[PDB]
Amino acid sequence: LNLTKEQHEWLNGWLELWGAWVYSGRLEKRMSSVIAKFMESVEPGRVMTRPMCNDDDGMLISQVVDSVMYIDKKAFGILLSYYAHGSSKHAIASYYHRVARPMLCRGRIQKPSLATCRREVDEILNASLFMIYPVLDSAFKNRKRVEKIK
Ligand SMILES: [Cl-]
Description:
The PDB classes it as gene regulation. With about 150 residues, this protein is mainly α. About 65% of the residues lie in helices and about 0% in strands.
């Protein structure tokens, strides 16, 4: 199946705010080893420019995303490259297309090109969002309920 237009737009905005929040260093490293190792692989010093969520929402989204994506560490890395580091899908595709194959974009009768790799990157991100959406929606709805109690 696939998410609807409004569901994708809703989730993408939250993940943009979360990615900016994570990239600023506001997520403590022990919460997610995958996210911790990722932030160690990005050039330091970069300044904040995009808007970010508050610490509560950031923690909630981090817990949801980690609980869903920790099994597919490569998809998790691509999600983080896109949302946290801010790399374009084009840049991610070009990267994985011009590497030394030490998983993604291996190559189908035709030789692997930038177009096929971009397609794979798009599909990985779409599948990730599809898996994340129900968990995040439930987490947000659950917090609201619990927050109302007394
Ligand atoms: Cl920390």
